[PDB]
Design an enzyme around this catalytic site. Sequence first.
Site, mmCIF file in Angstrom:
data_model
loop_
_atom_site.group_PDB
_atom_site.id
_atom_site.type_symbol
_atom_site.label_atom_id
_atom_site.label_comp_id
_atom_site.label_asym_id
_atom_site.label_seq_id
_atom_site.Cartn_x
_atom_site.Cartn_y
_atom_site.Cartn_z
ATOM 1 N N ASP A 153 -39.290 112.416 -4.338
ATOM 2 C CA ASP A 153 -38.563 111.557 -5.268
ATOM 3 C C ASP A 153 -38.439 112.162 -6.661
ATOM 4 O O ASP A 153 -37.809 111.564 -7.536
ATOM 5 C CB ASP A 153 -39.229 110.181 -5.369
ATOM 6 C CG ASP A 153 -38.924 109.295 -4.181
ATOM 7 O OD1 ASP A 153 -38.197 109.749 -3.274
ATOM 8 O OD2 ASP A 153 -39.407 108.143 -4.155
ATOM 9 N N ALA A 154 -39.005 113.343 -6.881
ATOM 10 C CA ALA A 154 -38.936 113.970 -8.191
ATOM 11 C C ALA A 154 -37.554 114.569 -8.413
ATOM 12 O O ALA A 154 -36.900 115.019 -7.471
ATOM 13 C CB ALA A 154 -40.009 115.046 -8.331
#
Lengths: 67, 1104, 105, 42
Positions: free
Chosen positions: B734-735
């Site tokens: 999710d970065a």
Amino acid sequence: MIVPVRCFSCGKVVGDKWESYLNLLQEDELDEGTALSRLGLKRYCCRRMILTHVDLIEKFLRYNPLE
Amino acid sequence: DEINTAQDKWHLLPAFLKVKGLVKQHLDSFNYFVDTDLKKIIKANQLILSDVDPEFYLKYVDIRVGKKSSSSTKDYLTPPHECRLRDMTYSAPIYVDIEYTRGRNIIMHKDVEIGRMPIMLRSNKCILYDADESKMAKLNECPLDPGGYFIVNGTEKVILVQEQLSKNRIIVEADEKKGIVQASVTSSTHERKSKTYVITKNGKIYLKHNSIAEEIPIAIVLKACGILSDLEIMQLVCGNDSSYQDIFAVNLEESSKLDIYTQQQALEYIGAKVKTMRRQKLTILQEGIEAIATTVIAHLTVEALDFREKALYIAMMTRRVVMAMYNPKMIDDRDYVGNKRLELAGQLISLLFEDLFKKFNNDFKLSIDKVLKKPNRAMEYDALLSINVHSNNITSGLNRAISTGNWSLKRFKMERAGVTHVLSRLSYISALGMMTRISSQFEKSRKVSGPRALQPSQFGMLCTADTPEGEACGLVKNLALMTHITTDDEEEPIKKLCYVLGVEDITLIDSASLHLNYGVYLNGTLIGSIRFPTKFVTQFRHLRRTGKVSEFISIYSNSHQMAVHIATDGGRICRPLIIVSDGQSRVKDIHLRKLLDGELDFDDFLKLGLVEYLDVNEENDSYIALYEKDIVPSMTHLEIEPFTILGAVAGLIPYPHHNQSPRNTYQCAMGKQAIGAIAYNQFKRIDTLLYLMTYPQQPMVKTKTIELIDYDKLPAGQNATVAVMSYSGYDIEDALVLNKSSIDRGFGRCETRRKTTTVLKRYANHTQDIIGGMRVDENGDPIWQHQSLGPDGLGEVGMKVQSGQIYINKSVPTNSAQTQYREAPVIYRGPEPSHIDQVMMSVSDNDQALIKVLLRQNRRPELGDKFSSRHGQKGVCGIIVKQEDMPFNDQGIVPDIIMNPHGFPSRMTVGKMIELISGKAGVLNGTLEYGTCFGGSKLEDMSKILVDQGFNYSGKDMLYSGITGECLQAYIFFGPIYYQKLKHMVLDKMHARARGPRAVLTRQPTEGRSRDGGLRLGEMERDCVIAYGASQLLLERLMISSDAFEVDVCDKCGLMGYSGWCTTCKSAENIIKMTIPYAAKLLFQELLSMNIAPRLRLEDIFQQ
Amino acid sequence: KEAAAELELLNADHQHILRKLKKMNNKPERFMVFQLPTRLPAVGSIRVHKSGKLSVKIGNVVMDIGKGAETTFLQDVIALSIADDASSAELLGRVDGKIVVTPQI
Amino acid sequence: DATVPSGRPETYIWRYLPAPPVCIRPSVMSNEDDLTVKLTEI
RNA sequence: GAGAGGA
Ligand SMILES: [Zn+2]
Ligand SMILES: [Zn+2]
């Protein structure tokens, strides 16, 4: 608030064209796409910098505390 | 041009929202309140009397809000923004009429203020009512502000809509866990509210109550209610079904097992076990009749000699119970939306004002009696002084009850907390979505998965995607676009209309034939039986459509129990639907043309009977078509548009019908906390915490909803050129990979504005607080702490402040309980410098100085800031990489955000891919594309536009690696995606402690972040440490680094001593010093304060 | 479905009530009870149509097409009177059935 | 266990209340906590 | 104190 001076993705200086763009929609009413293309905005980053912009400062200036 | 119905019927929603806006529950409820309930309560408590002086009475002839007498003009109210800035309360005076007598018997009139009622924003009383872009500008009010919220103590407090079970309605729940069924009704009058349960114990129907003793048999109460024949009971509870009579025969013999009964005897029996007390002496039979007259069912008051209505009501309750007994699954679900009502701000304020008004009248009458108690010279002149004395009490109570959210009432003994919430100001959609929000009546509902489920009955009534994810995930819901909350239309005329329509009354039908045909129930109480129910329903619906009755009166047919229900009470949720006749609709393609022309503003559509309001229950009897092309010649309603099943927040998502539902829910949750433009007057506003976007951008892929809620005029986000590609490795889970040289040009640039208030209170000793400051060191100049203070002690506007850097040098007297001024300055305690951009000095009503200083802080998208993607793809800024170290296409475009491709295959956000393609095609074509639920710009057209410009049909360009300068061996999804920056920034979350403040009680570090405190290593963490078998680390963490205390324990009696003194042995010889946690010492002292002695026994650590 | 069954039942009630009206032309002691909308719209006639259709009118032209109340029975119902508080309560007899009328559209 | 003193049935009935140290029941800002008020009432 | 994100 106002148009960003430079288009984030590329770097083109899109700050100056905004006013011109508005004229191309008011006098000699073109479409938005043709008006954007006539200003030299070829890459779609510069196109979305101008097309998808809200001129909020016009609304903000209605509440100036030094009228 | 020819209008096309299948694509122009959707234009009714703009008309509906123009005539009935999104925030219309609060506005309409408050307007109806101030227009009707004020005078209703006034005529209720219109008289105050006395034991002495019979020729003295006060008559409240009339009441008005903000209208002194004729006046001809609404009184001058403080503008809402002035109230917000000055921390006052937005309110209007209440002027009542006065009729006070005299010893000479002369009646005289007066018009005097009685208090100040707070005014809901944009109501019939607010000045903003019908203000157009010039009055609002002159009053520092945002034209796009929703309204519907009060300004109390300078705070925006909104009364959230409360959902509850339907009052005066039968709800039967079969608890198979024991074999027990019930028939409770929370009858709710304007004075009484009580539940009349009808349980089933020992196969025997009972009737419990909060006012009777225990489990009264049903046969006795039916005899006491008038039906004493003992055979009409079998014809009212079982009809002619053999399988029901044997079930109900068991409890029919309890009216003769104890002894045979008559009506008077049954009344005496029920009154004998009445737990209600009598303040005046009444016979047991007399009280028992009361127990049936009013006490049993507050809803129905039988003030006559015939109790047939109440008797048949109890009979129908018992019939429902027996139906549940014979076969379960015939019960009604409580979570069903049609069984719930919504009470808005108007009704709650009506209750609060009625309570306050009755208390005020009681106090005024007591004061009048006290003053007039004197036997002689009891003057009547200036009898209206105590009223103005107590007029402070009513307004103070009203403002306090609204502000604190605790609604304390005594008439109903009802206590509700958290009714009012502080209006959320993070984005525009946050403030709009806090309005039109519904709160469940359940407190926690720990494991009950009933009220937290998504009932299909809420289709079109509630937003089927917006719900606080987490611990209120299902409890809190939000209204949809097409949704109108009803109000109490009428009750008496509809009975006459039914009698005209051809239903025999309730006193003309025998019990034998009462279950042989449909019985029409008006608002829950049986009215009569009518043959041909279909004809009656059709005629009533025709009368409603043609405008004879109110549009909100809903009639429907239930066949499982033969009934024709008619519901008229307010709080029912209704939505508009297009009426379709046999085979074809009623819009007829020419009313759409008139609507687009400018006439038929959705009201002439109701008058002409083209559309009608359906509530949840009436939809049971209807057959609704999703689109005009699906109309078979049996459906009776048509959807105006299927994308109104989503609320205001859920309209943000582009192509929401392609995503997975949890993604839509997460977007609805996190769109409120997206920083961006808030209001047109956002710079003239001093709020506690405002997040602003420097360069907000309109979304590329719009939605038909966001045009109606004006989200394209105050957006919160920017169109980032996203390249969906695995890059740099710093974007695993999710970065994100933010692009430097775009942050530099301004992308995600934000601003945080925080207010600091200061009150220079005047003490009772005629001593004020002096803001004098600005000390000077040698050679002139201000000291470092005062380097940004200014001559007047209030920080200079535009300067910069840091840690220290007093900007409000406030001094306070040391003798508050003038020369001795203890200096108590306001210090900016921040981790990064911020600038002073506004300093407002004023006074409140009580004439005490008030200074509000607004500190602005310009924030840059640092690493670790949270960005959302308008699809639930929340993520953190994993790395910020330079422009040249980025992929570039043939034209040299580098992506602003490089989202990982692994977010898609397991979350199925195909709507995001379609958004990227539509946005790219629209920006190349120079137009804004529409992503709307069930429709929007088709993918084929966007791909055609994309291939016309020379780009790939799927939006996948072929990029060049920015660090090796060669082609990427796979084409890269490349295009503009509307990314919004969220408020959860790392600058506000970093927090570390080494030493600092400790709790006074247990000498342990404080908890919060405003107090420099440690991180709690709780039970789970110490169990984890135990698992590793780390003993010294456990001792160091939980004793040495948390709280260590060197105590002196006596070796004889294990009680702690001080300074090497046992205090019990008084010898100091056996004292031994050892270190234990201060929490343990506190526990030992608290145990010794009780009658417990934790005597510590010591042994040598050494010596084998 | 429901509409067709309702129409058939209405036709059956129309013919049944026409037969009942013809049969109770004898007047020994029998009555019949009518239910009417209130407010007294202002008499008319119970005009019978072809194929056994019955309707009523008032002085104003209004065709209240509603016929056939409950067929309720096993409840012996009789009608009496009151005469100026004197010797009164004269038994006027029982009723055969009930009719309810209703204005239509 | 009656071997030691205080091992008597009569030590479980309140005849003396141990008033706890003021550290256990501090005064905040005065504004005494609950225990001080309760023992004042006692 | 209690209103609400948040993971
Ligand atoms: Zn560019
Ligand atoms: Zn000792």
